[PDB]
Amino acid sequence: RFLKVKNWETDVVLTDTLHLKSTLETGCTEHICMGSIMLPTKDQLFPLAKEFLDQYYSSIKRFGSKAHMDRLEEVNKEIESTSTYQLKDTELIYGAKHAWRNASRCVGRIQWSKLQVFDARDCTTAHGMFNYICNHVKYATNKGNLRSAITIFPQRTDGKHDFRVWNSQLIRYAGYKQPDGSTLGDPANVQFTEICIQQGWKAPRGRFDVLPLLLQANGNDPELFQIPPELVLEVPIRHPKFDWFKDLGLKWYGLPAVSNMLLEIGGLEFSACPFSGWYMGTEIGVRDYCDNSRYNILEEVAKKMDLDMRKTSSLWKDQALVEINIAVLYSFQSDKVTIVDHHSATESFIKHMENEYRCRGGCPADWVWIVPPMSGSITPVFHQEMLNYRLTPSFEYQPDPWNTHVW
Amino acid sequence: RFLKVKNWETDVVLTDTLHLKSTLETGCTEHICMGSIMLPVRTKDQLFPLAKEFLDQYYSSIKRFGSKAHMDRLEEVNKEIESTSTYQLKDTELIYGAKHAWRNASRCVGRIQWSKLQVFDARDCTTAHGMFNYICNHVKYATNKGNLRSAITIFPQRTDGKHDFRVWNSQLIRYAGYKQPDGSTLGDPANVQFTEICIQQGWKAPRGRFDVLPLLLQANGNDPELFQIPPELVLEVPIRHPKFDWFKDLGLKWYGLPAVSNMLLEIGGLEFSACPFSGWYMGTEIGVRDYCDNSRYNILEEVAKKMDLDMRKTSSLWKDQALVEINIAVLYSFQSDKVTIVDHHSATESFIKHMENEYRCRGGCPADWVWIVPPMSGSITPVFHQEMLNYRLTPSFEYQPDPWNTHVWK
Numbered sequence: 178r179f180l181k182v183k184n185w186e187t188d189v190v191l192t193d194t195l196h197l198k199s200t201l202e203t204g205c206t207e208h209i210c211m212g213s214i215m216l217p218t219k220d221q222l223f224p225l226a227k228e229f230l231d232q233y234y235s236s237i238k239r240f241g242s243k244a245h246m247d248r249l250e251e252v253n254k255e256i257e258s259t260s261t262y263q264l265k266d267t268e269l270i271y272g273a274k275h276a277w278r279n280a281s282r283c284v285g286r287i288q289w290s291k292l293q294v295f296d297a298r299d300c301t302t303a304h305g306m307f308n309y310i311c312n313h314v315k316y317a318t319n320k321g322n323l324r325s326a327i328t329i330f331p332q333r334t335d336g337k338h339d340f341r342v343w344n345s346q347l348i349r350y351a352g353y354k355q356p357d358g359s360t361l362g363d364p365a366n367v368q369f370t371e372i373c374i375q376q377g378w379k380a381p382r383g384r385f386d387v388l389p390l391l392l393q394a395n396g397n398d399p400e401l402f403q404i405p406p407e408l409v410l411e412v413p414i415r416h417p418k419f420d421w422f423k424d425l426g427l428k429w430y431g432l433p434a435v436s437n438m439l440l441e442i443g444g445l446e447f448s449a450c451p452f453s454g455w456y457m458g459t460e461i462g463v464r465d466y467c468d469n470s471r472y473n474i475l476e477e478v479a480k481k482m483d484l485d486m487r488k489t490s491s492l493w494k495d496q497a498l499v500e501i502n503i504a505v506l507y508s509f510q511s512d513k514v515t516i517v518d519h520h521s522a523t524e525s526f527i528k529h530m531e532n533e534y535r536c537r538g539g540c541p542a543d544w545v546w547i548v549p550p551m552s553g554s555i556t557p558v559f560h561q562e563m564l565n566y567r568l569t570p571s572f573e574y575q576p577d578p579w580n581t582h583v584w
Numbered sequence: 585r586f587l588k589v590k591n592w593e594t595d596v597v598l599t600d601t602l603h604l605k606s607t608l609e610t611g612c613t614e615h616i617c618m619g620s621i622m623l624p625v626r627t628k629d630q631l632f633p634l635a636k637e638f639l640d641q642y643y644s645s646i647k648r649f650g651s652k653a654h655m656d657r658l659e660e661v662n663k664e665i666e667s668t669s670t671y672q673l674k675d676t677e678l679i680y681g682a683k684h685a686w687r688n689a690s691r692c693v694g695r696i697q698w699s700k701l702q703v704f705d706a707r708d709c710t711t712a713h714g715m716f717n718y719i720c721n722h723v724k725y726a727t728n729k730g731n732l733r734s735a736i737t738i739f740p741q742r743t744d745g746k747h748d749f750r751v752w753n754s755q756l757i758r759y760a761g762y763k764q765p766d767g768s769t770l771g772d773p774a775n776v777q778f779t780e781i782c783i784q785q786g787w788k789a790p791r792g793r794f795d796v797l798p799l800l801l802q803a804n805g806n807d808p809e810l811f812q813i814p815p816e817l818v819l820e821v822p823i824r825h826p827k828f829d830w831f832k833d834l835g836l837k838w839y840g841l842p843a844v845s846n847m848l849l850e851i852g853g854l855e856f857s858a859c860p861f862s863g864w865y866m867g868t869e870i871g872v873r874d875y876c877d878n879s880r881y882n883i884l885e886e887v888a889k890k891m892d893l894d895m896r897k898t899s900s901l902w903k904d905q906a907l908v909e910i911n912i913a914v915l916y917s918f919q920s921d922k923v924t925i926v927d928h929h930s931a932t933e934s935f936i937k938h939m940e941n942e943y944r945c946r947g948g949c950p951a952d953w954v955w956i957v958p959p960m961s962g963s964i965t966p967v968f969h970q971e972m973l974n975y976r977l978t979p980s981f982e983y984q985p986d987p988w989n990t991h992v993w994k
């Protein structure tokens with residue numbers, strides 16, 4: 178059934194058919210919508226494999242070719258024998274790019290095809306993983322001129338020899354629960370910060386301490402590693418009009434690299450597949466800095482701005498929030514570290530969405546996640562109806578490693 | 585069955601059972617979510633179960649479920665339906681129903697006030713002039729000199745669908761929009777189509793930037809009639825900034841009473857096509873949407889320009905910066921004229937408390953995240969971090985086709 182999506186700001190109506198190819202379930206039903214809920218075998222493997230291969234070959238205009246047919250048979254036999262199979266470089270690359278292309282929560286998918294894929298499937302040790310990771314970080318940071326990339330470690334076999342990167346992101350700050358009962362650093366990592374200490378890491382107990390990597394190879398226990406400080410590009414945060422801003426003592430890293438998700442291609446699962454792009458300003462300025470559960474810096478900034486924090490109606494939080502995000506973007510731009518603001522990113526997503534509709538016949542999108550956490554209605558995506566649904570290859574959530582590892 | 589909902593800022597988890605009473609569709613399937621889609625007579629056989637459901641609810645609320653009064657009411661209604669095909673609600677049932685349609689509106693962030701609603705029974709009204717008098721009284725009562733009071737006026741329910749009472753305006757009070765041959769628009773762009781219909785019907789448009797539109801009223805299915813709301817009844821607020829003396833020179837102002845008049849009210853199968861209802865504004869509705877939406881007044885550039893902001897590149901956040909001041913100004917003004925209004929921080933915080941309270945005494949609170957989260961500063965308000973469950977419950981307020989596209993002119 179054809180589904181239509183209207184943008185109420187421009188009246189443009191796009192038609193969606195791509196959803197017909199949906200596989201998984203949204204979590205919603207005809208009776209209840211869960212759009213705002215954060216997270217709602219051989220016989221199993223060959224169908225998924227076939228689906229993927231058909232996708233791959235149709236994309237290269239060789240749907241049905243002997244090549245297509247040959248490969249299909251090849252995988253089938255392989256699965257019957259090895260109870261699994263291995264992707265060819267080309268299919269790996271394609272799968273990775275398409276997992277991104279299909280990430281309904283990502284606002285920067287316009288860059289989907291421009292992804293550097295690093296095949297780390299020959300890795301065997303945590304030291305090896307560290308090596309692959311370091312090179313990834315260096316290639317991606319590229320001295321401020323960031324470049325999207327993903328490193329793919331060995332795919333899952335029996336689940337007991339799973340490769341995993343225990344960090345949620347390759348680069349994140351430590352979080353410690355102090356005497357006061359308060360939290361020093363990033364509250365979002367307090368637990369992990371502990372496990373690292375509980376492993377041997379010597380925590381510096383600072384506001385912005387870069388955590389160590391906890392790499393797991395072949396189901397073995399995780400080992401710690403320190404990313405070469407020279408490889409971790411960081412930006413000090415200063416305001417374009419408030420010279421006192423520098424006194425807040427804030428900084429953030431330039432490389433956002435997700436490392437706790439699972440990449441699924443043709444039924445195959447890769448539990449260790451760190452991938453990175455570049456920051457949208459609000460991510461740091463609004464969420465990391467102002468989220469109550471995070472660095473929660475609104476109070477301070479408000480104080481230093483000397484404004485009435487007596488009544489919410491003064492919108493002093495909104496006032497502060499803005500300047501702070503002015504300072505994030507400013508700092509990044511000044512040090513020449515790639516960064517995008519919510520206005521450009523959202524506008525770019527609209528264009529991308531428009532291309533995806535005429536080239537794909539659709540674009541899965543999660544409105545709740547796409548709309549920036551600030552100035553929602555003044556960005557285009559706020560007025561854009563979206564259709565959310567799951568498509569593979571895909572990136573998926575997965576249980577925290579420490580919550581399931583057999584030490 | 586049970587459904588857990590979590591708030592990622594407090595880790596508070598709530599259990600929902602109320603959704604088990606959801607009947608109507610949501611537009612979503614198991615393979616697709618249409619959460620961001622704006623908007624995805626009855627026969628006697630379909631009518632009684634609806635009446636029964638409602639009455640069982642009503643009676644259970646007054647703690648008289650199964651009583652004789654309850655049993656006889658069902659008997660009386662069933663008989664009435666079989667002989668007249670419809671049925672008349674008792675004043676108590678009408679009041680109960682109206683409050684619950686509000687209570688069940690998942691897109692409303694101000695439901696904490698749901699129980700405090702003044703219901704005006706206009707079911708004896710028979711003409712447009714009659715509707716005009718009723719509407720003037722609703723406006724006067726609700727405005728209350730700036731100290732707003734929630735209210736709803738209910739006109740005759742639908743019969744054969746050929747004699748509907750309808751208020752053609754989307755809101756009782758709204759500004760006219762005029763499209764110039766220039767291609768530009770004067771006034772509110774969102775009311776252009778309706779403005780035209782009024783002019784065509786005989787309205788003498790002042791052709792200004794803030795002209796209060798006339799009421800177009802349709803009684804008993806007859807052609808609509810024009811009426812001007814008494815000016816002294818229309819409370820308006822001039823918008824000025826607490827620190828920007830030039831703000832007042834922007835020539836901005838807005839009316840104080842938001843009163844929806846194009847929605848349909850459903851109570852026990854009965855349909856009330858004309859049920860204007862009003863409450864009070866949350867600051868962002870005027871300051872963010874009415875003033876800054878590109879397709880509305882669109883005053884961001886003029887405010888930014890006068891604020892002397894670097895408008896060379898979006899990354900300077902001039903739009904965001906100016907948006908906050910514009911919203912600063914709306915709140916300040918309304919407060920200076922003692923006209924009720926609530927900011928998005930207070931409104932959303934109250935909603936959270938209301939929500940939790942609804943889970944503990946009702947077993948849930950249907951809520952549409954996309955509409956509940958404010959159009960600005962989203963994540964610095966608690967609703968952003970709050971998982972919500974959206975499902976439909978009756979009584980309810982529904983959208984309905986524009987009268988001008990269905991009406992059979994006489």
Ligand code: HEM
Pocket residue numbers: 277280282283284285286288292325326327452453454455456457460517522572
């Ligand atoms: C090139 C620049 C990129 C930008 C500006 C961008 C921006 C964003 C933003 C703002 C979010 C929300 C993050 C959050 O709230 O936690 C997001 C989500 C997402 N992005 Fe992108 N993205 C980019 C690159 C990537 C890449 C390279 C991939 C994968 C190859 C990707 C995969 C995802 C996924 C899976 C999500 C959702 C994660 C989740 O569900 O928690 N993104 N992106």
Ligand code: HEM
Pocket residue numbers: 685686689691692693694695697701734735736861862863864865866869926931955981
């Ligand atoms: C007491 C003050 C009230 C406040 C602050 C409040 C606030 C709001 C706001 C901000 C919206 C979104 C409006 C938009 O974006 O267009 C909304 C939606 C809604 N409200 Fe309330 N409300 C109040 C009273 C009422 C009353 C009295 C009723 C019903 C009796 C009501 C019924 C609804 C409905 C039906 C919607 C959704 C409208 C739609 O779907 O288009 N509200 N309210």
Ligand SMILES: C[C@H](O)[C@H](O)[C@H]1CNc2nc(N)[nH]c(=O)c2N1
Pocket residue numbers: 213214215545546547592968969970971972
């Ligand atoms: C409860 C709600 O789902 C939650 O707060 C979501 C809303 N939208 C979001 N959007 C983005 N981009 N990132 C997030 O972490 C969230 N959190």
Ligand SMILES: C[C@H](O)[C@H](O)[C@H]1CNc2nc(N)[nH]c(=O)c2N1
Pocket residue numbers: 185559560561562563619620621622954955956
């Ligand atoms: C397309 C999207 O559903 C649309 O822009 C919605 C989003 N949330 C909203 N929320 C409120 N309160 N009011 C609106 O008009 C909208 N518009």
Ligand SMILES: CCS/C(N)=N\c1ccccc1
Pocket residue numbers: 433434435452453454455456457460
């Ligand atoms: C791949 C980093 S792309 C980015 N800007 N941010 C994200 C942060 C957390 C999860 C997903 C995306």
Ligand SMILES: CCS/C(N)=N\c1ccccc1
Pocket residue numbers: 842843844861862863864865866869
């Ligand atoms: C009933 C006025 S209550 C209010 N604040 N605003 C609304 C505006 C449009 C639709 C619904 C509510």
Ligand SMILES: [Zn+2]
Pocket residue numbers: 205206209210211212612616617618619
């Ligand atoms: Zn849904």
